[PDB]
Amino acid sequence: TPAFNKPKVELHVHLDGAIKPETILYFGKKRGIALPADTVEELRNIIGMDKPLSLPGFLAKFDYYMPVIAGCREAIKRIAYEFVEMKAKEGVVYVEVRYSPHLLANSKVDPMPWNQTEGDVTPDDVVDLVNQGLQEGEQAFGIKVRSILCCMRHQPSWSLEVLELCKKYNQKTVVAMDLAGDETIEGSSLFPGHVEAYEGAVKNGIHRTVHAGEVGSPEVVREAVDILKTERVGHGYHTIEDEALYNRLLKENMHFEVCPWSSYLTGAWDPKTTHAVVRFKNDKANYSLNTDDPLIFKSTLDTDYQMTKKDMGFTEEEFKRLNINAAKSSFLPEEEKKELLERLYREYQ
C-alpha cells in the first residue's frame, strides 16, 4: 500500500547508484570481470546496506560493481534505459538523474578509474550513451528524464571538462552540473577547478547544484551557495545548524534535495534526533524527496515517502506541496517547466 500513489518529481538520484543487480551480474559474466557474489540475491546483499555505515563504507560499495559497467557501451546505454523503466514504475513523471561521465569512461581520462585497460569510451562518449538510453527510455515508458553531470570533489582536474559537456549536450539531455563525492575533503569547494567551472557555469546559464551539508558543516553549504553560486543544495541537512544561514536560504527560497532513507544509511543523520526534513516541512521550506542511490540503499521512492509518512507525520498535502516545489526548482527550460506544473495540478485534482 504505497504512501503517495500519484505523480512525483525526483531531482537527486545517481545513475551509477541505481542499476539492477541482474544487469550488474549480466555484465560481470559477459565481460569476465569479478564480482563479490555470483547470484542476484547475494549481490544485492553485499552491494546493499541495511544498517548505517560511515561515509567510507558507503562509497566503497561502488568499487564492487562499477568495474563491470564502466568502459562498456552496451551497459552504459542499458543502465540508462533501465533507469527510466524503474522510475516510470515508481510513478515518477519527471526526473533528473546524475552521474560522473569520467567514472564510466576508459579512454581520454586520467587517472584511469577502476584500474581499467585503455579502451575506446571517452567521457564524451559516456554522455552520449546515457543520452541515447534515457531518450530510448522516454520513448518507451513515457516519462520525462533529464541528466546532470557530476564534478567529483577529489578530482578538480575534471571539472572544466564536465562544464564543456553540459554545454555541448545542453537539454539533450544535460540540464545542469553537480559537485559530488567526498564532502569532507577539507576546503575542496575552493579547489580552483571547481570554482572556475562553477563560474563558467554562471556565465553560460548552465544550471548548478552542489552536494553540501550531508555530512559537512553549514560552512560547506555556505560555500556552495555564496561561492559556487549553486541553485540547489544536495542534502543540506546540516544547514539548520546555522540559524542565520538557514533563515537566509529559506528567504531566498533555496531548494534542498532531501534523501531521507539515504541520510539514515550513510550515517549522515543521527537517528536519535529529529530529521532535518521535519524542520523543512514545518518551515514551508523548498525541498524535494529523493532516493539518492536506490541500488545501495535497497530502496525505491516509496521507501522514502513511507518513511516520512510513518515516522515524520507527512500528509498527502505536503507530498503534493513538495513535488510542486521540486517542479518549480527543476532545471527545465521555462515552457517545459510550465507543462510539468500543469500536469501535476491536473493530476492532483
List binding-site positions: 12, 14, 16, 181, 211, 292-293
The residue to which cell 561561492 is assigned: 227
Listing from the earlier edge strand, what are the strands of the sheet with 144-152?
A: 8-10, 92-99, 144-152, 174-180, 207-212, 232-235, 255-258, 286-289
The residue to which cell 516519462 is assigned: 143
Query: Which residues contact residue 289 at a Cβ distance below 8 angstroms, ignoring those fewer than 6 apart?
Result: 8, 10, 258, 259, 260, 277, 301, 304, 305, 308, 319, 322, 326
Query: Which residues contact residue 113 at a Cβ distance below 8 angstroms, ignoring those fewer than 6 apart?
Result: 66, 70, 102, 103, 105, 106
Q: Are 106 and 128 in contact (CB under 8 A)?
A: no
Q: Which residue positions form the known binding site for Zn(2+)?
A: 12, 14, 211, 292
Active site residues: 214
Q: Are 96 and 175 in contact (CB under 8 A)?
A: yes
CA distance 33 to 162: 28
Q: Which residue positions form the known binding site for substrate?
A: 14, 16, 181, 293
Helix (H, G, I), strand (E, B) or coil at 170: strand
